[PDB]
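Meet today's protein:

…
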Amino acid sequence: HHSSGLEVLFQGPGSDAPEEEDHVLVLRKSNFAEALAAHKYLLVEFYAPWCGHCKALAPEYAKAAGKLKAEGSEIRLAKVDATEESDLAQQYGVRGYPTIKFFRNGDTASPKEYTAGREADDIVNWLKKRTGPAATTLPDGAAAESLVESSEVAVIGFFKDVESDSAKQFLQAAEAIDDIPFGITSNSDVFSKYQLDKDGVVLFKKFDEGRNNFEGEVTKENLLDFIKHNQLPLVIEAPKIFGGEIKTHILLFLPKSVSDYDGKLSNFKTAAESFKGKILFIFIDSDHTDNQRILEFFGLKKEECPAVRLITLEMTKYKPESEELTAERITEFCHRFLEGKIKPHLMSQELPEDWDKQPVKVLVGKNFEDVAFDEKKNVFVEFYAPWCGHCKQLAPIWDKLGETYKDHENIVIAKMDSTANEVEAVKVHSFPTLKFFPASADRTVIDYNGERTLDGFKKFLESGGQDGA
């Protein structure tokens, strides 16, 4: 009826507004949601006519569509010219072209990004893997083994009736995950192979416990939680890291170029055992330039590593009391942290000789206390990062503010690089962060949450921070 029938309606253009170009569906903001409701498998390309990547890609996109049609496949390809549908494209955060996204069952909340090859054949292939059965049917034990053996991590469901409710939820979760192979079996021999007492699920992996058994009601939600949780090894080398439930991280900085890489690495591994859900153990290669930001964020060079640092994400940083990395010292550090016995680790660049030369004063960890907490001064401080776009957008305004106050008796405008400096009294996780320290108010701090404009700042300052944000 509805799930598959269109009844009498006129919602948008008549002709000759094209509906299809070379088997590719033309979509607009007036025929988008209808397309998604009518096609359970729809790849959509967002392009612009002046983009060279698009101009090049068009004929292969067409070819793949033509081949798909010649096979009477359910899958269809569409396109959206972003220049004429910009709201539509903005809706999916499309910045840059082409941006290709795959929609399953018309759900607009879980599009999968297409990053694969640019030839018609790799398009079709990608789509064929992602369509059809979410798990591979396993006929026997050899198949099961062959599957767990093929991947660092694999997941198998055991269901007597493959069309049953729980089987269908399991398949539901199989669809949501791309980086793990899934398999499914109704063979009771395969149940026995894995010691199952009834319909259930198991995750195999090439490290640690070697395996994890699912417990509880079988639902898409429960399985996604079970997997994303047991998928990572005790010691991980990104997006999954932040996805995590644990807000306490320990980092071993390990140059791939170090002597006895695997031994020291193993000492770390040994210490990870005492904290499973308590603290996340992470190692990283301090040689690879991709990490050089992180290093500087912890105040380390390259010859100072290996080293270990702790960080609570809501947020101070710590390091161990001693320089020795043994399993035992790592463990001891972790425990001394958990007791509140480890005191935070602070860093500061060196105080430049011209810090106070400009109207905006420059602070580092060392003179910060001295200037910001002076009882006689009203100090307005910007905490920023060097590579931050929002900090770059604020720079000219902050300078203007400094300018208008440079001759003030008691008001001082200033800034600190918060990637390079850690201070006791203030903790910054986002950038820029703006904070006011009034005169003759002890150590009161007031946050600036209002407009970032010369105007908002003047109102704020002239009122002593009592009106602003």
Residues 52-70 form the longest helix (19 residues).
